[PDB]
């Protein structure tokens, strides 16, 4: 609110806190991103290394979607089972009856392996897996079932 603003305080001093010598003028540096490669290059290399020129390949008509594939680490995974249903399985961890987890259904695309899942068996349905992901799962005596 205007009330708490510094111009209210500058009323009565000549230069509005913009200086007697160097004034406040329209556009001294030029406008915009002007001078990038000249009188503003020190600020652009440092703060913005990498700004000018090109790198890899163009991709005409890229459709994000094509590449839709969220990740879920073993880190969680057990989260995708409802709270109450969860403790049910952690104790009584077994083959013959082990939880099915449809990670696709939970809206994930690949399972990665960030760390340590208890030795409960899980049946894990995914589109993709980290080689470790699958490994670790197996070490608890569960498997991975590839879907779509």
């Amino acid at each position: 609110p205007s009330r708490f603003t510094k111009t209210r305080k500058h009323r009565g001093h000549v230069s509005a806190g913009k200086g007697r010598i160097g004034k406040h003028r329209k556009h001294p540096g030029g406008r915009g991103m002007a001078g990038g490669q000249h009188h503003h290059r020190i600020n652009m290399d440092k703060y913005h290394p990498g700004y000018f020129g090109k790198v890899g390949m163009r991709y005409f008509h890229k459709q994000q979607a094509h590449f839709w594939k969220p990740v879920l680490n073993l880190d969680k995974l057990w989260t995708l089972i409802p709270e109450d249903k969860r403790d049910q399985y952690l104790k009584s961890a077994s083959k013959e009856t082990a939880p099915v987890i449809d990670t696709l259904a939970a809206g994930y695309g690949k399972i990665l392996g960030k760390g340590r899942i208890p030795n409960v068996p899980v049946i894990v349905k995914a589109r993709f897996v980290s080689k470790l992901a699958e490994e670790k799962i197996r070490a608890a005596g569960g498997v991975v079932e590839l879907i779509a």
Binding site: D45, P49, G50, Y51, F52, G53, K54, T79
Partner: protein
Amino acid sequence: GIDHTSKQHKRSGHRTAPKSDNVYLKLLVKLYTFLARRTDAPFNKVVLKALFLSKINRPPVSVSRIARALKQEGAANKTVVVVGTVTDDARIFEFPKTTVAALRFTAGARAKIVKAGGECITLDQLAVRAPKGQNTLILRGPRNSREAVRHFGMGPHKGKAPRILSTGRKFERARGRRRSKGFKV
């Protein structure tokens, strides 16, 4: 005159109450300034200041970070104190008993603790139980995990993360970031 040798009328630079405007916080502070003026226990002195701290200097402590501290040799029966909120961490699968004294407890954090039959205690309750902070473990959270501190100290050869908005190939990955496009950083 006086050849001064140090800047005159300098404020000490430390907060002195909180900037915050919450009655309850202002009461907790009323409590601990008393205990710190009148008990000479160091603990009370530390806490009084942590109450003044702002939201950034109060990163959250997670129940799993809590579980780990109790894992310390000799420490399982201590009561962890947190001058901040405590949050939940589904990544730990086995949470201990104990007694956590904090400012806020998130819904799930409070549940996790209690579900293992532990206790969640407010600071004033902690005070009545332990006016010298007897048998207490103070925990602070990771301050320089903030996203912001990523961009501090940006310069050549510092490795620090552009303040950048859109962010893919062809956003600041060219001349100045690789040997084949001018030079590298």
